[PDB]
Amino acid sequence: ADTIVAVELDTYPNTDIGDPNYPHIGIDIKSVRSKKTAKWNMQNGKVGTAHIIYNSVGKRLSAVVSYPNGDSATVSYDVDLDNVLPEWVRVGLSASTGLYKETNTILSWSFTSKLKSNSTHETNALHFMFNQFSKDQKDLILQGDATTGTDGNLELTRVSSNGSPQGSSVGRALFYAPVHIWESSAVVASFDATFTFLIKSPDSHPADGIAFFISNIDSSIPSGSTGRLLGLFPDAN
Amino acid sequence: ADTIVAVELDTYPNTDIGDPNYPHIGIDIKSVRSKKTAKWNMQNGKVGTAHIIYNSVGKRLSAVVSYPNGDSATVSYDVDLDNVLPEWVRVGLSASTGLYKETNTILSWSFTSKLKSNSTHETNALHFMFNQFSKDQKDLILQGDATTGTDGNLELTRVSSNGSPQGSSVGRALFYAPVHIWESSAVVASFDATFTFLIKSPDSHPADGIAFFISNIDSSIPSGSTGRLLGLFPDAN
Amino acid sequence: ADTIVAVELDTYPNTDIGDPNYPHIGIDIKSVRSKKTAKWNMQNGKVGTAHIIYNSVGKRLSAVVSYPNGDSATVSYDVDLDNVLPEWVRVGLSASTGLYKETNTILSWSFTSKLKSNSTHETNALHFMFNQFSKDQKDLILQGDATTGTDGNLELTRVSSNGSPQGSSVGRALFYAPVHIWESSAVVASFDATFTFLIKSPDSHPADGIAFFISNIDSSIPSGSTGRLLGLFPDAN
Amino acid sequence: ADTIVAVELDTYPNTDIGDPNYPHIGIDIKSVRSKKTAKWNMQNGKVGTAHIIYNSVGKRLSAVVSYPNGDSATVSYDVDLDNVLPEWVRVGLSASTGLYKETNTILSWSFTSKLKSNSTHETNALHFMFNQFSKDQKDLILQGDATTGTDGNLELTRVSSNGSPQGSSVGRALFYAPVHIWESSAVVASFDATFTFLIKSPDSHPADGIAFFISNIDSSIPSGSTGRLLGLFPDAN
Ligand SMILES: [Ca+2]
Ligand SMILES: [Ca+2]
Ligand SMILES: [Ca+2]
Ligand SMILES: [Ca+2]
Ligand SMILES: [Mn+2]
Ligand SMILES: [Mn+2]
Ligand SMILES: [Mn+2]
Ligand SMILES: [Mn+2]
């Protein structure tokens, strides 16, 4: 199926599938069942920022999500991505709502990838940065309910004309170009991403989350992957 | 018909179609007959560097080609590219051989695009850098004879395994993601590109050159644009 | 004395010294008497952004100042900076108030410098970006009334504890490291800066302006250079 | 006493002071006795590349040294640098020779620091890149025997004009601007550095190595830290 590495901003505790019982940031290596989570004090209606960093020297995938107020949640996991992901991938943002819902608004998203082979100055790099998203954002593949342009933002999941989030929605945006994430003869593979999000819900509890992910290039939304599956996984195995 | 903006490193004078009677650098606005040229002393078998720069504020497209010994040619052209290019483009390198030939070897290629909309820190950006090209370079669209991987280089045109370039070859490499080159709502759009090239004619009678170009996203090698048309234009109008 | 190249955001028309009779953006080459101005619809109390770009291929210094609302003023001037500035310089922000006053608040400031010599990949570069300024900003030399830290901003000129700007104030912030702006054997010298500013005045008219400047390294505020002189020039010659 | 964080490319085993009995790479936290080393097969007379990376999220300092043939050594150390370094530092390269010698030639050096405070797009950044060092390199502080300009390189230690390195030489180059490496209010601090070096011993008995270091801003070469102390430490404690 798809090969997924993701950092999830999981807004809803599905302890049924191994979520801790609080909103959490998590590192997901080919399963929605995070290898590692940290409690995340999600702030309904605040703008937050997630930073995801990997270096292939230290082989440690780290992520922080924070709110200006100051609250901040951190998670790291040792993983050799050489062993997990295909050589070439796509990188994206995914979000979902289920029975409970939230806006999954991306205000900005940036990504830098570096790939060095041994041979002096031999870095390849990709960087993109979106601070504004237009109606027709041709460097993004939008999947599912993802739209761009409304207030210059990427709405990952359905929002009504009056800003009201809809449930059972899933959507993703992938950067258009494949990303070379490792090679046979790589000295340093390394990447980082940042995105700023606004998760707002009128419900008793927001759900389900936003994920930064890295997939096989031809990745698409697994069917049924709204709600707790986060646009990322066909099931909770 | 494609819409092409190019900077050509034109190694062969086709005075026939308006070339000056020497190797030149030129800025091509929708025609192989450059709007502006400068004399260029192509150094056969040496690694050269071309830098292309444009910002939407000064509305000047500028290019330099230089070699390590310090010899360099420069050309600029005042042009408002919103009047020329679609809002969304691909960027690429193109090369051809005709009756005469040369290696059109790209050793590295990088590009930066920035687009700022009205709205305060509101920059979108694309950057990529290839200092090494792999046999399977999925973030490049390879067209015609273009191959990558051969010594970690991009050979835009056909070169036999002994290192000998072939006549009537065209090839191009376009970056995979479309590039947002302008918008209505744009305070600043700007881009710059650099590539290093090894043009070598074992005759020391080189043809036809290399171009950095910007095209409509669906651009392909026009029919019969080997030789002097540099993989860019259907004819010499 | 000092060698100054500046882009001025001149908020006050001193037609006595050659200002056009409206707020204006201007390019100043060793004189406060701009070589080139454009009318600038200054918006008292709005956050604006100025972008300054130079490439040494095109030898055209350009600047745009804009407000999110959408208003935007542009100016360019052909100048070989090789001939104006010393090889090594400092880059800074300057502002002043006089009889009339305004806050000269910098919210952010970034700068990129590139210097290539002929010799393939041989780029030197400096980039810095400040989105927040702390109390003790050791990579900035603060001159005159310039302070950092109050709300994470750089206040270039005196503001009272309640946010009220003071007249006859001058201040500057220079990036700490000297910048190599040209060399003998430079293929491309090129730089750009961005800053976002908030100019607010309670007076009948704001004054006097903010300038992005490039100076000799040992540059200091010319005495008496409050008001129309903008922290930049000892006189209006 | 200076506060030093270093990554050493240590070419000479002083088993005396805890070095392993082979050339190694190591992470030095306030002591020349590395907290972590990895075997390093220094290739005499070849141009190597060292990459150093740290982010404050994963809290792992990682380094690789490699040569073009693909041989590479890697070392990581879990460290929270806020516990080690002052908030404001300088970064630099250091080298020494002692009884044994080697060229400590730096062909290029680059560094990127990012510091994000609580506050939403709130990143401060410093980047510099030297691919060519000039005789008068005003953005470097040169200490001890360090000179620049000689072949566009930085010779950290004394080399005679025939190309022959000298014993008991120390030198360093610190980037001129202080670097904000952490703050209380910091969501993410991270940095990475790269330098390429040519260590050559015309005996093929090299000493003593090169280090990338981060120090208190006022750091100078400690007394008698030629040889094994690498210009970094006053003694071998
Ligand atoms: Ca969940
Ligand atoms: Ca031609
Ligand atoms: Ca004025
Ligand atoms: Ca040693
Ligand atoms: Mn979860
Ligand atoms: Mn031509
Ligand atoms: Mn003026
Ligand atoms: Mn050691």
Author numbering:
A (entry chain A), B (entry chain J), C (entry chain A), D (entry chain J): 1 to 237
How does the study describe this entry?
We report here the crystal structure of a native and complexed lectin isolated from Canavalia gladiata seeds, describing a new binding pocket in ConA-like lectins, which may be related to pathogen resistance, a site where a non-protein amino acid, such as α-amino butyric acid, can bind. The most recent accepted definition establishes lectins as proteins with at least one non-catalytic domain able to recognize and bind reversibly to specific mono and oligosaccharides. The oligomeric structures of CGL and CGL-αMM involve two 'canonical' dimers, and these dimers are associated by salt bridges between β-strands. In both CGL crystal structures, the amino acids involved in metal binding are conserved.
